[PDB]
């Protein structure tokens, strides 16, 4: 998540003040500049796990084509649950199941 100029709406780029030795975010079409809070200017993940469990919707229990199991919900302890494998579909994706209850909709595994 990156921020934008509050008066120009354009993207703010990181900058360093030579005299102050501080990190700043400065727009390019305007003189607006704001102090940087975090030092993590850039991050790149070679191996990532996002998109595995993020694929959750509140009304996934209304799908009739999804199998229904009897795994115990940690939160609601309901007798009815719906499970599915990982939404991320890379060639080396694990086959672990994600179980969703009909009340709390918490995603969990059998591991």
Partner 1 sequence: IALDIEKAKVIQSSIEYTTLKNVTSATEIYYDPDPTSTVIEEDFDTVEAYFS
Partner 2 sequence: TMKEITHAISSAKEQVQEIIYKAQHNELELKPGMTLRESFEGEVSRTLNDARDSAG
81 is in an annotated binding site: no
d(CA 99, CA 86): 11
Among 2, 19, 37, 42, binds partner 1 (CB under 8 A): 42
70 binds partner 2 (CB under 8 A): no
What DSSP character marks residue 86? -
Q: Please identify, using beta-carbon distances, which residue of 8 and 36 lies nearer to partner 1.
A: 36
Question: What is residue 60's three-state secondary structure?
Answer: helix
| Site of interaction with partner 1 (CB under 8 A) | 14, 16, 21, 23, 36, 39-47
């Amino acid at each position: 998540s990156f921020r934008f100029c509050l008066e120009c709406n354009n993207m703010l780029y990181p900058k360093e003040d030579k005299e102050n030795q501080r990190l700043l975010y400065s727009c390019r079409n305007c003189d607006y500049t704001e102090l940087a809070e975090d030092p993590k200017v850039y991050r790149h993940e070679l191996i990532t796990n996002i998109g595995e469990t993020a694929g959750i919707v509140d009304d996934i229990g209304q799908d009739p084509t999804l199998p229904r199991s009897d795994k115990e919900c940690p939160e609601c302890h309901s007798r009815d649950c719906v499970f599915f494998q990982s939404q991320q579909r890379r060639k080396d994706t694990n086959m672990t199941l994600f179980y969703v209850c009909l009340n709390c909709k918490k995603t969990f595994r059998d591991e």
